[PDB]
Amino acid sequence: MSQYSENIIIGAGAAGLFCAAQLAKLGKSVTVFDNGKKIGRKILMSGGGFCNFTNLEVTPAHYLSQNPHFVKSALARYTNWDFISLVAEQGITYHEKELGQLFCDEGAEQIVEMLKSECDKYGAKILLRSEVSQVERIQNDEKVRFVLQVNSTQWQCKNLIVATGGLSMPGLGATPFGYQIAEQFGIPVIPPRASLVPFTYRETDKFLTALSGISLPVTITALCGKSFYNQLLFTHRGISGPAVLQISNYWQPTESVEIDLLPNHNVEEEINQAKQSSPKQMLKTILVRLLPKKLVELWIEQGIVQDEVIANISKVRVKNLVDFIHHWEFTPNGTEGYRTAEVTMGGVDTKVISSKTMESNQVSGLYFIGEVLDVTGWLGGYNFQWAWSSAYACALSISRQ
Ligand SMILES: Cc1cc2nc3c(=O)[nH]c(=O)nc-3n(C[C@H](O)[C@H](O)[C@H](O)COP(=O)(O)OP(=O)(O)OC[C@H]3O[C@@H](n4cnc5c(N)ncnc54)[C@H](O)[C@@H]3O)c2cc1C
């Protein structure tokens, strides 16, 4: 057996499925291989089961990359609105959760269903339980530029689109195959790291484990200056939540994070209003009215915060408390693994890839789309949008040959 398909796609995920659909729709033959048992396994998990498919405010600045000028082209070619429009026209209902985030009303199944439907509608063939391996480059054959082993059959193609994703969720089928193919052809890869992931506590902060389950709004600021205002969640392992997941993109191993527990109010102003309006009251009572009761109690049960009458508090101790709550210098021991991480930072170096095409500069006929590229977006549907955009730029480019 020796099959052929002008276009082969490795990975039946967000980027793979969408690209396969665009190609069939533009009238090109394409086959998709996937080591998994079902298509779009991560799409089904995204957005807590409803799929945060994009965000109303998308710009290149919502993406992390060694190469800042990369993302702009594909994002402007196929926009968040081009997809929002495809979704609505496709009969899918969605709503805005917060911060421009858009989710499906009827679950992530809608997105996966729409993708699989477009592919069936235009001719794309999807083969599951097919793990790709042994990719070889062919040089003389004008019709065959690549050969590869899928199970026991050898496939041949003119264009090979790599949409294998990143490393998070290994139990879901995640593979480094995309990087392995790149490295085999001498294509540079930026060292991958788990991102949009929780932080783990060092020994000195382990006592905060007692706060597990508690949640509050804070502002997290990374050493590079980036800030995010959102919810922070105390865990058994460390700290998590939207604010933490967001800042893990800008945080670097060995680095510290600046956490403001009371971003909202101006503690001193308040502590003073209570110093006049309640000279009798305890510090603990004024504090619990601002922060979670159990956190305030823990600082006390740890002797970190003295509980005295508002009146018996020197203006200097009031200013040390204020700085203490607004400037918590947190140094995580590290990050949780790829089993919790939402994405993977790093990947194929985007400077050797085409900004307009997604095609490899070093190896013609080889394309990289999706998360495998060194393009990581913010939490909030940005990662899926990059998948739609890069998959489209690739398909549109190939249809033009
Ligand atoms: C728990 C969780 C929740 C998430 N929620 C959101 C969200 O709400 N919004 C958002 O924008 N993003 C979200 N993401 C991230 C998002 O899923 C990805 O950024 C996006 O799916 C990347 O698309 P992709 O096609 O590159 O890869 P994937 O969607 O991962 O698909 C690639 C496929 O390639 C296949 N593959 C790998 N190696 C091989 C091989 N050797 N042979 C054949 N096939 C192979 C895999 O089976 C995989 O299914 C979430 C991620 C996780 C883990």
Swiss-Prot record:
Pfam families assigned: HI0933_like, HI0933_like_1st
Superkingdom of the organism of origin: Bacteria
Gene: rdsA
Top-level enzyme category: oxidoreductase
Record family assignment: Belongs to the BaiN/RdsA family. RdsA subfamily.
Binding site for FAD: 15, 34-35, 41, 47, 52, 132, 371, 384
Lineage: Bacteria, Pseudomonadati, Pseudomonadota, Gammaproteobacteria, Pasteurellales
Source organism (scientific name): Haemophilus influenzae (strain ATCC 51907 / DSM 11121 / KW20 / Rd)
Statement: the UniProt record of this protein carries the keyword NAD: yes
Biological function: Catalyzes the synthesis of 5,6-dihydrouridine (D) at position 2449 in 23S rRNA.
PANTHER family, per database record: OS12G0638800 PROTEIN
Keywords: FAD, Flavoprotein, NAD, Oxidoreductase, rRNA processing
Essential cofactor(s): FAD
Name assigned to this protein: Ribosomal RNA dihydrouridine synthase
EC number(s) on file: 1.3.1.-
Reactions performed catalytically: a 5,6-dihydrouridine in mRNA + NAD(+) = a uridine in mRNA + NADH + H(+)
